[PDB]
């Protein structure tokens, strides 16, 4: 409604770095807000794509951003009659970023790992890894919970059970208020997908450079399964947290699995012990239901509501014809111990191949009416197909069915404007929460400042 579309701020990164692929707000110890931006194709030391992270200070005029430096050198450790190896080439550092407290977590989902033992190996595979930083103090740490030292032969003998060699840990990431890092690894357990959790504090205090394989006792990974309904489901393709069980001492996880059950797709709500509380099945095969998930209370009843994107949903049109436009589903949380019923609202895209629902951002309460609102991305929508972000306002009954505002991409075709969104944070300290929109195709970020309502 009241996002200022006339005077935007632009941050830009190196060409071909995919600057803006992921982003988040970041408050230092003093509460000063900055933007953290992932650029998963930034060049490394050997002029080879390794990805990179940038920490952009708030400036009304934007501009260039300083790097958040991480170690990009491959590592080798000859220990226990074995050889441990990390490969950061094309690792995609910054494919996701999330900020909690004064810490920044930037993940490299396709960082590769291997173990050699004489003439045998574990296999060079993308276990992924996360780089944690405390910018002010300069502290650095890592977390790579899918790394292992089991040889290839052993997996074969065990029928490839508990195989975490292709986790791609950090594909998606979230941090609970308590400070527990939760990493989605859609390739885990031979492409079933797994979640990995561990306290940020414990990740830091147990990490030391050079070790490569260390224990984080307090960590907690989800489980493997023999059920084919989970095969190639990419469980952990997207993740979020929230309160869905009443008990405020417990935090519940929300996991998207867009290819679950033979591409029907699903999203599940779980407890911290990975026990399923609810499951929401997709409406249409290959719609990629679960591609994105958002958690926010939109009807001001204090109960967190769930939003699920299905960017490839095909709408039914005249003469028995389907048009791929994308769809978003709203599930309102019922009073007390009860199951989430049918979706309360279906938002469908308009532009063909627009991919409406690829990203969904809670905005907080944008117009200050007492209800939280959201933004939905259609990275290839708009009449021009250059991309579009649509704002939907909350209300007592859920959400408005029509958008209160439409942000058209200021960038050229192919910028993927909206592929990443983040809101609910007042960056200029003007009393209204603001929106930051990534456009990795154009290697830029746009900041939309919310202003007092005009009407």
């Amino acid at each position: 409604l009241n996002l200022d579309p006339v005077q935007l701020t632009f941050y830009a990164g190196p060409n071909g770095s995919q600057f803006g692929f992921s982003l988040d707000f970041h408050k230092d110890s003093h509460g000063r807000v900055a933007i953290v931006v992932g650029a998963p194709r930034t060049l490394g030391p050997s002029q080879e794509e390794t990805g990179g992270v940038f920490l952009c200070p708030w400036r009304a005029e934007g501009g260039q951003c300083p790097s958040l430096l991480f170690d990009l050198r491959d590592e080798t450790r000859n220990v226990g009659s074995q050889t441990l190896q990390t490969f950061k080439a094309r690792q995609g550092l910054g494919a996701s970023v999330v900020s909690w407290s004064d810490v920044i977590v930037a993940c490299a989902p396709w960082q590769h790992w291997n173990v050699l033992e004489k003439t045998e190996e574990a296999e060079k595979t993308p276990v992924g890894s996360c780089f944690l930083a405390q910018p002010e103090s300069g502290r650095r740490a890592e977390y790579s919970p899918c790394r292992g030292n089991t040889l290839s032969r052993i997996y074969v003998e065990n029928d490839f059970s508990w195989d975490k060699r292709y986790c791609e840990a950090g594909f998606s990431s979230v941090v609970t208020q308590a400070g527990e890092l939760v990493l989605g690894a859609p390739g885990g357990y031979y492409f079933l997908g797994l979640l990995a959790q561990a306290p940020v504090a414990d990740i830091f205090s147990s990490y030391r450079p050079g070790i490569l394989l260390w224990h984080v006792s307090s960590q907690s990974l989800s489980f493997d399964s023999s059920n084919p309904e989970y095969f190639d489901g990419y469980w952990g393709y997207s993740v979020a947290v929230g309160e869905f069980d009443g008990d405020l001492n417990t935090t519940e996880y929300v996991v998207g699995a867009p290819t679950w059950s033979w591409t029907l797709g699903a999203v599940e709500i779980l407890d911290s012990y990975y026990q399923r509380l609810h499951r929401l099945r997709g409406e249409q095969m290959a719609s990629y239901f679960g591609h994105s998930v958002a958690v926010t209370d939109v009807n001001g009843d204090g109960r967190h509501d769930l939003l699920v994107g299905a960017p490839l949903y095909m709408e039914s049109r005249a003469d028995r014809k389907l048009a791929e436009v994308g769809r978003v589903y709203l599930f309102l949380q019922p009073r007390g111990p009860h199951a989430l019923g049918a979706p309360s609202l279906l938002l469908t895209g308009t532009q063909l191949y627009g991919r409406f629902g690829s990203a969904i951002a809670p905005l907080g309460d944008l117009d200050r009416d007492g209800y939280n609102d959201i933004a939905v991305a259609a990275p290839y929508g708009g009449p021009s197909g250059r991309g579009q972000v649509l704002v939907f306002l909350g209300q007592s009954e859920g959400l408005r069915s029509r958008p209160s505002q439409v942000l058209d991409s200021p960038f050229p075709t192919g910028s993927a404007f909206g592929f990443s969104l983040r809101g609910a944070v007042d960056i200029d300290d003007n009393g209204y929460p603001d929106l930051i929109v990534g456009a990795y195709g154009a290697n830029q970020v746009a900041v939309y400042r919310a202003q007092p309502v005009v009407k």
């Epitope: 000859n78 220990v79 226990g80 030391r208 070790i211």
Partner: antibody, heavy 119, light 108 residues
Framework: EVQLQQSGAELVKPGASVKLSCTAS????????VHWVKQRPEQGLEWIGR????????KYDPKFQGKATITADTSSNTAYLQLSSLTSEDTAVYYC????????????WGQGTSVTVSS | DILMTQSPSSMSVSLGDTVSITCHAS??????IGWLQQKPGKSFMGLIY???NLVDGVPSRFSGSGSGADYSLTISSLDSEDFADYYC?????????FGGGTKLEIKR
């Protein structure tokens, strides 16, 4: 707090078999590797072997192959070390060990189990 | 097997001294070494791991160093408790191997 409660002192005769235990307290035995170490006054410290209680796979120093047998029961959260065909040279204090962070380290030790072989 | 020549076998020193034990390997072990302490009539306690890293709860007066096949545990300002047996251990290769040991005795 991590603690390894090893079984009490053992006093057996030559040729017999003994089985030592190492119960984990404050953590799951399945968490990390579990090594066994033999100690004698003159000879010093000798690494016997290790076990991964999760899957049961073991490794031994070829000096102890046949003599020592390391097992683990995740149920009782305990790791064991069995010594067969005992002799005088088997008279030593035995320790169970596990790493702190580093997968391959030797940081936490049990109080130790004294074994004496005599007729 | 990798041999660990740990010297000296013993040394007589007083409180507040700064002493350094050394450890030589029969080959390179790239910092894959650990240092242990055994107070008289008691079990073992981890001091250092992977060359230089202090085990949780260990006084900072302890410190590990060195590379290749030579390493050193150093104790700055000796304390009354520090008078005990110290061993080094390599886990660069299986089987793991220990040093001869070093007893810190009081001088007079």
């Amino acid at each position: 707090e991590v603690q390894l409660q090893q079984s009490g002192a053992e006093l057996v005769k030559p040729g017999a078999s003994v089985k030592l235990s190492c119960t984990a307290s404050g953590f799951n035995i399945k968490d990390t590797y579990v090594h066994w170490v033999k100690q004698r006054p003159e000879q010093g410290l000798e690494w016997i072997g290790r076990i991964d209680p999760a899957n049961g796979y073991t490794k031994y120093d070829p000096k102890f192959q046949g003599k020592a047998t390391i097992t683990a029961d995740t149920s009782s959260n305990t790791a064991y070390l069995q010594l067969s065909s005992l002799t005088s040279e088997d008279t030593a204090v035995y320790y169970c060990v596990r790493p702190l962070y580093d997968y391959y380290a030797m940081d936490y030790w049990g109080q130790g189990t004294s074994v004496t072989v005599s007729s | 097997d990798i041999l660990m020549t740990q010297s000296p076998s013993s040394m007589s020193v007083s409180l507040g001294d700064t002493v350094s034990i050394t450890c030589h390997a029969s080959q390179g072990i790239s910092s894959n070494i650990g240092w242990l302490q055994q107070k008289p009539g008691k079990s073992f306690m981890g001091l250092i791991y992977y060359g230089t890293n202090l085990v949780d709860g260990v006084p900072s007066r302890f410190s590990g160093s060195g590379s290749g096949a030579d390493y050193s545990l150093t104790i700055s300002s000796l304390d009354s408790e520090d008078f005990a047996d110290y061993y080094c251990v390599q886990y660069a290769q299986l089987p793991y191997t220990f040093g001869g040991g070093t007893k810190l005795e009081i001088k007079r």
